[PDB]
Amino acid sequence: LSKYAYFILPLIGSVTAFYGGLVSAFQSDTKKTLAYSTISHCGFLMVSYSTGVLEFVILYLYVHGFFKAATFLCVGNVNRFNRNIQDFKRMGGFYKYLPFECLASFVCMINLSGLPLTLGFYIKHLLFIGLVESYTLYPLIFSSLILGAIAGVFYSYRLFYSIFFDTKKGKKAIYLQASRIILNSKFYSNTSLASNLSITFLVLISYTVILYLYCTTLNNYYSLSDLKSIYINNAYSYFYKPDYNFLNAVSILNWFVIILLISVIYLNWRWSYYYTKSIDSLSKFILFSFFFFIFSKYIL
Amino acid sequence: MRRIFWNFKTAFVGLPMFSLAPKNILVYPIVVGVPLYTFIVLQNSVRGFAYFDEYDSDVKE
Amino acid sequence: FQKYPIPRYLHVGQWIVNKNWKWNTFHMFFPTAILCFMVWRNSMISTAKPPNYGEYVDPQSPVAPKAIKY
Amino acid sequence: SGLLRNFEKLVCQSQLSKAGHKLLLRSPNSTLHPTAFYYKRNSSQRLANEMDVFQLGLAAAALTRQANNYAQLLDQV
Amino acid sequence: YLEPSYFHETFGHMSQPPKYDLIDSNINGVEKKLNKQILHREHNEHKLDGFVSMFKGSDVAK
Amino acid sequence: GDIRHKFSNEITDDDYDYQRAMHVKPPKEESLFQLTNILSSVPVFKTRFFLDFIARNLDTNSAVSTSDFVAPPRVHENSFFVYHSRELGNVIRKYRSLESIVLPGALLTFTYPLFAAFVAIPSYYFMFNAKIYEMSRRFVVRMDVLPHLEMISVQRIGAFGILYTKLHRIQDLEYVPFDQVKEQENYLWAIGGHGVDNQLIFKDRSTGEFFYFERQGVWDAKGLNHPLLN
Amino acid sequence: NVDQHELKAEMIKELSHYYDHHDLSLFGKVQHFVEHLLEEKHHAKINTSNFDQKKLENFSESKQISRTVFALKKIKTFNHDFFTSEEEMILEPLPLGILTYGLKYAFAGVDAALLTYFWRNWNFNVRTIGLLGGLVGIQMATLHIPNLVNEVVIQTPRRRALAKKYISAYGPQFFHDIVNPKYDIEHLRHLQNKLNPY
Amino acid sequence: HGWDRPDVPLSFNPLYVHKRELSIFDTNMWMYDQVYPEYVISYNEIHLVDQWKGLKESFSQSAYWWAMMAMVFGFYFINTTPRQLGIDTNDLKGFLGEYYGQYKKRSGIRSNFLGLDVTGENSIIQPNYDRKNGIRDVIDSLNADAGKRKLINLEAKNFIERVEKECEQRILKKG
Amino acid sequence: GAWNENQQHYKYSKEEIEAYQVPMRIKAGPCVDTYIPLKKCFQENPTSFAAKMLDGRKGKCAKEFKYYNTCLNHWQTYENNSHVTNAYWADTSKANADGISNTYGGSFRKGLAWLN
Ligand SMILES: COC1=C(OC)C(=O)C(C/C=C(\C)CC/C=C(/C)CC/C=C(\C)CC/C=C(/C)CC/C=C(\C)CC/C=C(\C)CC/C=C(\C)CC/C=C(/C)CC/C=C(\C)CCC=C(C)C)=C(C)C1=O
Ligand SMILES: CCCCCCCCCCCCCCCCCC(=O)OC[C@H](COP(=O)([O-])OCC[N+](C)(C)C)OC(=O)CCCCCCCCCCCCCCCCC
Ligand SMILES: CCCCCCCCCCCCCCCCCC(=O)OC[C@H](COP(=O)([O-])OCC[N+](C)(C)C)OC(=O)CCCCCCCCCCCCCCCCC
């Protein structure tokens, strides 16, 4: 029943989401990257509340909390291995020294950044399902929401690749001291077995709880308990029985994400022996995608 | 650790064991099991295997 | 961080390990559990829950909310 | 380089490795002669001011060839 | 596999693998042709009735 | 320095074999289901028909370079070879050939060709113009010198995978320093100038045409050490 | 009033473009136009009086079981409240699983890789085009294969068991009357299933 | 390992020597410490000399993001239709009904239950049942949108009934 | 017959709605009559969230879910005007000519990217 809320929650939420995601896409520190990602997701939570659907707010909160916590633990192990240097400009090649951290960080980042086919993608899609279009500042709000939703790819890819699979930008003492032949044993680990088990169980329980919440809310049979709210809008109609225009708009968003993925994967910012072969791979991937679309839709 | 030493396929515990165990374990079950079981099953059906259909089942609503 | 000596007179918790920590854990957990059990009983005396599934509130029953008779 | 394909017409890299062979490359859109690059009418300034003897000779030869061909065509009009 | 809606939105609807009952083979002759025509008419009428029920049941809930 | 031999329960090198699919290591043994073992054990691959099929398909030996010196066929009777691209030119031509099938295929097979074009326009202008296309336009696929004209024949790649040769006067050629073209084209040199020599950039000043040469391209000493080219 | 079949045919003609037509590409429109000529004619009135029925005594027990399977399929097509969920699943085509879907998309990927290889190397000849055509034809046939195997091996025993359950409860003559084209479909819509607890 | 390291040196906490007068005009402007004293506010972006230069730089560089937001909005504006969003029209006696019911009953300005000759208006926080501002604009917009959606559904029903009647007339007329 | 009606054509009272703990979101819509038997059956058939999330027929709750799904389809279509919107999307010219809904058709713009 507040006009101030109606005006301030979506605008501030969208501005915050855009700002946080954009700054996180440029941060070289891991902890600062995750802090600005948290700022962006808090803005998205504000927007989700402004949509009038509280179930979406609960789902977004749970997904963001679980995967942000797991990513924080992974980057904390990385920082401890790097001896309290949080910037990834002094990292790279940590996949071998931190295998579990690499793989768990991959999973938690693809879930956290809302990459397609993931729970983050589901929560962002739900956010865009219920976004009201009657706001005076809707242009700015929607543009900020789009630019903050596409910003997850950048910071997720940058963090993961720079930490684990970039060149060895770190110091020689970090790598050489952990790679001595005497240390080779069945007990060898640059992290703790307890840390690995904690992160694994955290991810498993997060998946179980998020799936349970999705089944309780997003299923055809709505089984969630009362949220004690009498303001019921029609945002669930577009989740259940959407029209073609909304599907095409979310398709626009998906193709923006795809183009950004193509950019981050294939852009060569530095000279390499594989520069020509990278362009060849891009060309053959484009042709293969076109022919795969042709065959899977028409021929068979 | 447990550096096992085992002549595979030339030893009593191995391929000869695989070839030998089924043919000897399944001797009495196949020489006194089948005849006894057949006698016990077929001694009832001196006149037939038919099930005398009590509770009708020949009636439909 | 490399361990450094700590003054013997200082009652600080830096690198403090008690060799008898198991009995201390026992005698700090179990009585705490008993205290919390007593507090839990006391608070369960004053506890409200909505009706279960298949149960409705009779509006004329004393349990139903009441209005002031001026 | 090819499936269910024969390369009889393909030029061998062994042939290409020898200097002085008699192979000629024919490429699409290959303008190998500048016969029309430096011909322009309604020049603002002198052709000598804007062009040198090489370009002027190219243009003059092209114009002479075209005029002679047209004069040849004049014999059956 | 279970929520391919992203592929439906992003790449459109692809050609599903062929699913058919092949149950009409039980009967043979002109009866099969007549029943197939009846079933095709029923399917078309069912799609039309779904459309008409969607466009008519608007004021049922009051 | 390793002391795993001193202990029994310590991990062995045979346990570190599942990591071979993830860690590069010299081969130790061939597994039962390895591709080499499958090909060398199944007798159907020993038959002549499979051997003949393999020996007459895929890449041909005629296309394999047989020397470290190559003389491409002359573009003109009097011209002499100077410079030729090797693999970047092939990749550029194969990438620009996508416009000959994918672009018409997009028109004839996409439900919304206007949507495809509306997404491709910013992709080109913001990412792909400075990545591949503009470098291809300035890329010198081949360079020969016609001495009678005292000019250079530069063969380049055009939009749909085309090839076209242009003639440029030698006296009109100038050297363009990278620092001279550094700031005005930073994006191109950031994402699309790695395969070409940024320290060897030339320009036909009559038309303002830029000549970029591949770093992996081959130069002929005889053509380069010519009085026309000094 | 008017004939309901003719009225619904006219309404289909009037409203087909509203619900039965989605957006298509140029090649999609070409395929739709081609298939429209090949599509079955939607006839409002179908002459069922030209058919002569054969009594059950001619048919064997297996043929009667097959015909009552078809009768149950007809009822499920007309009356949607007749069968339970499990009976409908027995009577419906079996959904295709990961084997079939991965098979189809592996075929599509192989075709796409081959076509990419042909385009990049310009390997387009009569032999190559024939190979592509044969490959796509074989792939289509062997993608039709899993549905046939599913239907026969799994459903057919289940459908025959369902029919035998229904034969002993309704009547072979009842199902023979149902499969007859002259049977009133309007009466079939309102038929109450004795074998459904509802 | 491999060397007997001495204990952690006292140089790990260097003693700070005050070389400057601690001005009273900088009171609590410094975090005071005997090791590593600091200014109370850290300026990592000191390449901007002032806050006005910082504002100018921020607004100059934020123009790129303004342009990008404009491009995104234009792309979604020439390619997307506004949706049918609003309150659930099957429940109008709820959130919308209660608002207008409260503004209609005016129970906050009734007489005192004891005759104290004071009503709700006699307070700093007092009711105003003739205000016509605030969330009422949004409530009116939601009610109008619900009415519009109901009208669209009614028009669709009328259209389908008209089509059915026209088809019946067409088939019956020809005979 | 009606989509909002359940199998037994029984209307549920306020006390029954309270006792069966109908969520407010369902209560706002018109599908309480079809939702209540489904929830009753699910209470009588306690299944894990995986069973609900995976089963397409909802297992034992088949008929109740069929009625509730029909009601949900109609309810979310009418709350969305998705039938009219899809009719105008399939053929914008024919829908305007027929006047399916002039209120929606007078402010409908498909978009350049979607076949103009
Ligand atoms: C990139 O951000 C920015 C940040 O990061 C969040 C920053 O930290 C900072 C730094 C800020 C400080 C240090 C303190 C300042 C505090 C702030 C809160 C500044 C925040 C600034 C912004 C959020 C940027 C806003 C600036 C612009 C130019 C808006 C960007 C959006 C567009 C350009 C889209 C253009 C919209 C158009 C053309 C609408 C045209 C109208 C129609 C098409 C009609 C449609 C019909 C309807 C019914 C819809 C109604 C629409 C209306 C009425 C339009 C109104 C909307 C508008 C936006 C005008 C700055 C400067 C910044 O810059
Ligand atoms: C009037 C002009 C007509 C021609 C315009 C041509 C513009 C596009 C030129 C580039 C075409 C090549 C890129 C797409 C290749 C096919 C991909 C596919 O399956 O699309 C399905 C769909 C076809 O489905 P559809 O268009 O029938 O409908 C469903 C899709 N929606 C609802 C979103 C419209 O293709 C597209 O949506 C095409 C989008 C192209 C956007 C620009 C791409 C630039 C980057 C090029 C590299 C892309 C790599 C592969 C990415 C996808 C796979 C990971
Ligand atoms: C020039 C080219 C020449 C060659 C062209 C290609 C020729 C064919 C090449 C081989 C492809 C064969 C395709 C047809 C297969 C038909 C299968 C069938 O009948 O399915 C009926 C169906 C397929 O099931 P379904 O997945 O479709 O769904 C069944 C229905 N539901 C979902 C309800 C369960 O059933 C089965 O396949 C039975 C399952 C058990 C099968 C046991 C045998 C071993 C195979 C196990 C599965 C596969 C494991 C390996 C996977 C791959 C690993 C790398």
JSON list of C-alpha atoms in Angstrom, two decimals, chain E residues 7-54:
[
{"chain": "E", "resi": 7, "resn": "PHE", "atom": "CA", "xyz": [16.03, -24.47, -26.27]},
{"chain": "E", "resi": 8, "resn": "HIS", "atom": "CA", "xyz": [12.40, -23.88, -27.25]},
{"chain": "E", "resi": 9, "resn": "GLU", "atom": "CA", "xyz": [12.79, -20.13, -26.69]},
{"chain": "E", "resi": 10, "resn": "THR", "atom": "CA", "xyz": [16.33, -19.70, -28.00]},
{"chain": "E", "resi": 11, "resn": "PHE", "atom": "CA", "xyz": [16.43, -22.05, -31.01]},
{"chain": "E", "resi": 12, "resn": "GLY", "atom": "CA", "xyz": [12.73, -22.68, -31.66]},
{"chain": "E", "resi": 13, "resn": "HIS", "atom": "CA", "xyz": [10.92, -26.00, -31.80]},
{"chain": "E", "resi": 14, "resn": "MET", "atom": "CA", "xyz": [12.83, -28.86, -33.42]},
{"chain": "E", "resi": 15, "resn": "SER", "atom": "CA", "xyz": [11.46, -31.90, -35.23]},
{"chain": "E", "resi": 16, "resn": "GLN", "atom": "CA", "xyz": [10.52, -34.40, -32.53]},
{"chain": "E", "resi": 17, "resn": "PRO", "atom": "CA", "xyz": [11.36, -38.06, -33.14]},
{"chain": "E", "resi": 18, "resn": "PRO", "atom": "CA", "xyz": [8.45, -39.93, -34.73]},
{"chain": "E", "resi": 19, "resn": "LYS", "atom": "CA", "xyz": [5.87, -41.11, -32.20]},
{"chain": "E", "resi": 20, "resn": "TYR", "atom": "CA", "xyz": [2.87, -43.04, -33.51]},
{"chain": "E", "resi": 21, "resn": "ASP", "atom": "CA", "xyz": [0.63, -45.71, -32.03]},
{"chain": "E", "resi": 22, "resn": "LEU", "atom": "CA", "xyz": [0.67, -48.07, -35.06]},
{"chain": "E", "resi": 23, "resn": "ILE", "atom": "CA", "xyz": [-2.46, -49.49, -33.42]},
{"chain": "E", "resi": 24, "resn": "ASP", "atom": "CA", "xyz": [-4.80, -49.15, -36.43]},
{"chain": "E", "resi": 25, "resn": "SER", "atom": "CA", "xyz": [-3.08, -52.19, -37.99]},
{"chain": "E", "resi": 26, "resn": "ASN", "atom": "CA", "xyz": [-5.38, -54.43, -35.92]},
{"chain": "E", "resi": 27, "resn": "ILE", "atom": "CA", "xyz": [-8.30, -53.91, -38.33]},
{"chain": "E", "resi": 28, "resn": "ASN", "atom": "CA", "xyz": [-8.11, -54.40, -42.09]},
{"chain": "E", "resi": 29, "resn": "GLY", "atom": "CA", "xyz": [-10.16, -53.37, -45.10]},
{"chain": "E", "resi": 30, "resn": "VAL", "atom": "CA", "xyz": [-12.42, -50.42, -45.81]},
{"chain": "E", "resi": 31, "resn": "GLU", "atom": "CA", "xyz": [-13.38, -50.43, -42.13]},
{"chain": "E", "resi": 32, "resn": "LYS", "atom": "CA", "xyz": [-9.85, -49.26, -41.35]},
{"chain": "E", "resi": 33, "resn": "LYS", "atom": "CA", "xyz": [-10.16, -46.40, -43.85]},
{"chain": "E", "resi": 34, "resn": "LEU", "atom": "CA", "xyz": [-13.54, -45.32, -42.46]},
{"chain": "E", "resi": 35, "resn": "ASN", "atom": "CA", "xyz": [-12.28, -45.43, -38.87]},
{"chain": "E", "resi": 36, "resn": "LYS", "atom": "CA", "xyz": [-9.13, -43.49, -39.80]},
{"chain": "E", "resi": 37, "resn": "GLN", "atom": "CA", "xyz": [-11.25, -40.80, -41.46]},
{"chain": "E", "resi": 38, "resn": "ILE", "atom": "CA", "xyz": [-13.52, -40.69, -38.41]},
{"chain": "E", "resi": 39, "resn": "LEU", "atom": "CA", "xyz": [-10.54, -40.35, -36.07]},
{"chain": "E", "resi": 40, "resn": "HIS", "atom": "CA", "xyz": [-8.95, -37.61, -38.19]},
{"chain": "E", "resi": 41, "resn": "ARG", "atom": "CA", "xyz": [-12.24, -35.70, -38.18]},
{"chain": "E", "resi": 42, "resn": "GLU", "atom": "CA", "xyz": [-12.44, -36.20, -34.41]},
{"chain": "E", "resi": 43, "resn": "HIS", "atom": "CA", "xyz": [-8.91, -34.86, -33.92]},
{"chain": "E", "resi": 44, "resn": "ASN", "atom": "CA", "xyz": [-9.63, -31.77, -36.01]},
{"chain": "E", "resi": 45, "resn": "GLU", "atom": "CA", "xyz": [-12.92, -31.20, -34.19]},
{"chain": "E", "resi": 46, "resn": "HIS", "atom": "CA", "xyz": [-11.15, -31.67, -30.85]},
{"chain": "E", "resi": 47, "resn": "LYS", "atom": "CA", "xyz": [-8.59, -28.99, -31.70]},
{"chain": "E", "resi": 48, "resn": "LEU", "atom": "CA", "xyz": [-11.41, -26.69, -32.81]},
{"chain": "E", "resi": 49, "resn": "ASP", "atom": "CA", "xyz": [-13.39, -27.46, -29.64]},
{"chain": "E", "resi": 50, "resn": "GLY", "atom": "CA", "xyz": [-10.35, -26.66, -27.51]},
{"chain": "E", "resi": 51, "resn": "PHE", "atom": "CA", "xyz": [-10.01, -23.31, -29.27]},
{"chain": "E", "resi": 52, "resn": "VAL", "atom": "CA", "xyz": [-13.74, -22.58, -28.92]},
{"chain": "E", "resi": 53, "resn": "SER", "atom": "CA", "xyz": [-13.80, -23.60, -25.25]},
{"chain": "E", "resi": 54, "resn": "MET", "atom": "CA", "xyz": [-10.84, -21.32, -24.56]}
]
